[PDB]
Amino acid sequence: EFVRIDPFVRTFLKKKGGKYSVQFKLPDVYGVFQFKVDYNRLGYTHLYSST
Amino acid sequence: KTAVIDHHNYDISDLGQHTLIVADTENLLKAPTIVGKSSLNPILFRGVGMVADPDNPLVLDILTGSSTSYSFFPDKPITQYPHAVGKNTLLIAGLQARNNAR
Amino acid sequence: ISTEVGITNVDLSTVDKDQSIAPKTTRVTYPAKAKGTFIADSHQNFALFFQLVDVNTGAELTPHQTFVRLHNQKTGQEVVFVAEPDNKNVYKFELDTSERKIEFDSASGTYTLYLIIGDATLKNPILWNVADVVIKFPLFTPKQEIQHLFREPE
Numbered sequence A: 001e002f003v004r005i006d007p008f009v010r011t012f013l014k015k016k017g018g019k020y021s022v023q024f025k026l027p028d029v030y031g032v033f034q035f036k037v038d039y040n041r042l043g044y045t046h047l048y049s050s051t
Numbered sequence B: 001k002t003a004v005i006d007h008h009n010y011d012i013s014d015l016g017q018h019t020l021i022v023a024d025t026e027n028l029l030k031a032p033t034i035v036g037k038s039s040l041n042p043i044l045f046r047g048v049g050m051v052a053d054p055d056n057p058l059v060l061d062i063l064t065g066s067s068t069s070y071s072f073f074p075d076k077p078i079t080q081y082p083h084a085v086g087k088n089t090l091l092i093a094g095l096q097a098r099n100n101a102r
Numbered sequence C: 001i002s003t004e005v006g007i008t009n010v011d012l013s014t015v016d017k018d019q020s021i022a023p024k025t026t027r028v029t030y031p032a033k034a035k036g037t038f039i040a041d042s043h044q045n046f047a048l049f050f051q052l053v054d055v056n057t058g059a060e061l062t063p064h065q066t067f068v069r070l071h072n073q074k075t076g077q078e079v080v081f082v083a084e085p086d087n088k089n090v091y092k093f094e095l096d097t098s099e100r101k102i103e104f105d106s107a108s109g110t111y112t113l114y115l116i117i118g119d120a121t122l123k124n125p126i127l128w129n130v131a132d133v134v135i136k137f138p139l140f141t142p143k144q145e146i147q148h149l150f151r152e153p154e
């Protein structure tokens, strides 16, 4: 998720090598945007990384 | 002083109170990370029935009761509404906190 | 010492909120399914009256657990109600739409009336559905993908 206050772009990460990587384009709006990767599942731990 | 009393699913090895409850492997959580991959035979249980909030994001329910099991004092007659009367009787219940504490 | 439970008289009634018409009552046995489906709404309320006796000298035997549970086949939701033993030795149940709106959380659908009865001293844990009653009232998953709508070039 590419969020500013609310998500502008949500995409599925795709596996290559050993990493989930995706390439896309940045929307027209300027500001401070952050990437939230939040993986929450039934049984797994909660993953959360925001840059 | 309460117990998960069930009158349709009691094992033969009981004290005549039907306190022992045989829980089937159907009403489980159905997540292979918690309850393992294999197929399980019906399990045995003798304990106090708890309940959890339906709109609770953190709580889990590893093993609910059966369809007719109720939790109330085995000696006293039922006067109030019994706590966790149906399939919302919880037997095994887990929590995964915000710090990932199991 | 164990005992064998038995159900003697069961009356499925459809009472109308209006006084003028008399209620229509239909009787059924213990291992049976009622013919047709009853309806209960704002205009008509549901009523069931039953009596339980022992096989031998069944002087008003009262089981420890007697819960009337309605299972919704379409959505899976089920609701369990207690049984009230009036001093005439008659267990009675009255299903209202305005009065018991909160129990069903105001949801209209077709329910099945299962009756659970049996206790520590009874021999057989009865479970037979009386009839299909129609009641009508007045996070861990991927989210939806979003794509950005760019500005149209002139």
Ligand SMILES: *[C@@H]1O[C@H](CO)[C@@H](O[C@@H]2O[C@H](CO)[C@@H](O[C@@H]3O[C@H](CO[C@H]4O[C@H](CO[C@H]5O[C@H](CO)[C@@H](O)[C@H](O)[C@@H]5O)[C@@H](O)[C@H](O)[C@@H]4O)[C@@H](O)[C@H](O[C@H]4O[C@H](CO)[C@@H](O)[C@H](O)[C@@H]4O[C@H]4O[C@H](CO)[C@@H](O)[C@H](O)[C@@H]4O[C@H]4O[C@H](CO)[C@@H](O)[C@H](O)[C@@H]4O)[C@@H]3O)[C@H](O)[C@H]2NC(C)=O)[C@H](O)[C@H]1NC(C)=O
Pocket (backbone or CB within 6 Å): A006, A007, A008, C146, C147, C148, C149
């Ligand atoms: C000055 O400061 C101000 C304060 O911050 C700034 O104001 C803020 O500005 C932003 C954006 O300008 C606003 O966000 C938007 O609000 C829109 C209308 O609001 C609805 O809000 C409710 C719905 O939102 C709820 O959603 C759930 C529901 O529970 C809930 O979890 C959530 O928290 C929230 O409560 C609703 O109740 C109201 O009635 C309103 O309908 C809303 O439509 C916007 O959503 C857009 O955009 C977001 C991200 O931008 C997307 O995630 C959405 O899916 C939706 O996306 C649409 O537009 C995108 C690009 O525009 C497309 O890429 C999408 O595909 C999608 O396109 C569809 O819709 C288009 C029509 O719009 C169609 O043309 C398309 O074909 C698609 O069908 C967004 O939420 C803030 O509300 C606002 N805040 C305040 C306080 O005013 C202000 O911007 C600052 N000034 C400047 C100059 O920047």
